[PDB]
Design a protein around this ligand. Structure first.
Ligand code: DQJ
Ligand code: MN
Length: 302
């Protein structure tokens, strides 16, 4: 049958008073959000940070992703990597989506891309290939947020965003222990996806979509982490079942309905431009991009 969308994860629209400190706000919403694994945070309408990346010199080499690579298990010269700019990648991304759905990219419903994505993942008749830039360090290209540094120029109206606590460059990243950490950038297109994973050291993670088409998320609360791992190991290929989790997490693709049928609670959301997504400790999550977009993420500690 067709894909059944999971229930929506919590969406918070804090006022200017509640939006003062991120760590205190996440701590207040924890009793609900930790029961869903992921949550979406919409900043106030007037909170609009400018895009501070060097678009003129942004040249990256995206990865190549075959959607049905695991289903094909039942030659490593499929496609080279190539190099794009932010504009040339966007032209390729919009052309791919408009030609695939035979309609303008802004007219494709999010539910349709969602149902088609999971059909292509398990399809052996069609081989769809997409590209995406991932784990791009914001120290080589600059962060999407304004940052006080000698390289970039900060307008007076942009200094508040360079000093804001919701600026991902200002999140605490040093974990406490007895006796370098920079946000990463993500340039996506239609069907470009990330498989089920948790963060290193079970850390928190916060994600911001600077611009572009939405990013679809799926989340599992931490109390069902061991249940997801049991379902994953029972249905993964025998060659990948005994692999360590940090290696298995590279190919942990699974339809959310399969997890839901085994009793694993799964929540979804469409992260739109200007919205935050927070994943809680040991909350497995996965998803895909609806189209050409630009995201930034960092793991933080409380
Ligand atoms: C900070 C870093 C270690 C990180 C990123 C994520 C993550 O979960 N995401 C999901 C959305 C974005 N990845 C994509 O958009 C790829 C192209 C499909 C980053 N977790 N830790
Ligand atoms: Mn993550």
């Amino acid at each position: 049958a067709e894909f059944v969308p999971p229930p929506e994860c919590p969406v918070f629209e804090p006022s200017w008073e509640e939006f003062t400190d991120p760590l205190s706000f996440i701590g207040r919403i924890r009793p609900l959000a930790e029961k869903t694994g992921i949550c979406k945070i919409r900043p106030p309408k007037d909170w609009q940070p400018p895009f501070a990346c060097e678009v003129k010199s942004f040249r990256f080499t995206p990865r190549v992703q075959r959607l049905n690579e695991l289903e094909a298990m039942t030659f490593g010269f499929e496609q080279a990597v190539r190099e794009y700019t932010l504009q040339s990648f966007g032209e390729m991304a919009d052309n791919f989506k408009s030609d695939y759905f035979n309609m303008p990219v802004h007219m494709v419903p999010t539910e349709l891309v969602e149902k088609e994505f999971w059909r292509l993942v398990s399809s052996i008749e069609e081989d769809v290939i997409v590209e995406y830039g991932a784990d791009i360090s914001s120290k080589d290209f600059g962060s999407g947020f304004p940052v006080k540094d000698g390289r970039r120029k900060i307008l007076p109206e942009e200094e508040e965003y360079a000093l804001s606590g919701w600026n991902l460059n200002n999140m605490p990243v040093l974990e406490q222990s007895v006796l370098m950490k920079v946000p990463w950038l993500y340039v996506g297109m239609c069907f470009s996806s990330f498989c089920w994973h948790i963060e290193d050291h079970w850390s928190y993670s916060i994600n911001y979509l600077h611009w572009g088409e939405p990013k679809t998320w799926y989340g599992v609360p931490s109390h069902a982490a061991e249940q997801l791992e049991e379902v994953m190991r029972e249905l993964a290929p025998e060659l990948f079942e005994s692999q360590p989790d940090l290696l298995h997490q590279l190919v942990t693709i699974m339809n959310p309905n399969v997890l839901m049928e085994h009793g694993v609670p799964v929540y979804r959301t469409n992260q739109c431009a200007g919205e935050f997504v927070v994943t809680f400790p040991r909350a497995y999550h996965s998803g895909f991009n609806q189209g050409y977009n630009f995201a930034e993420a960092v793991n933080f500690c409380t």
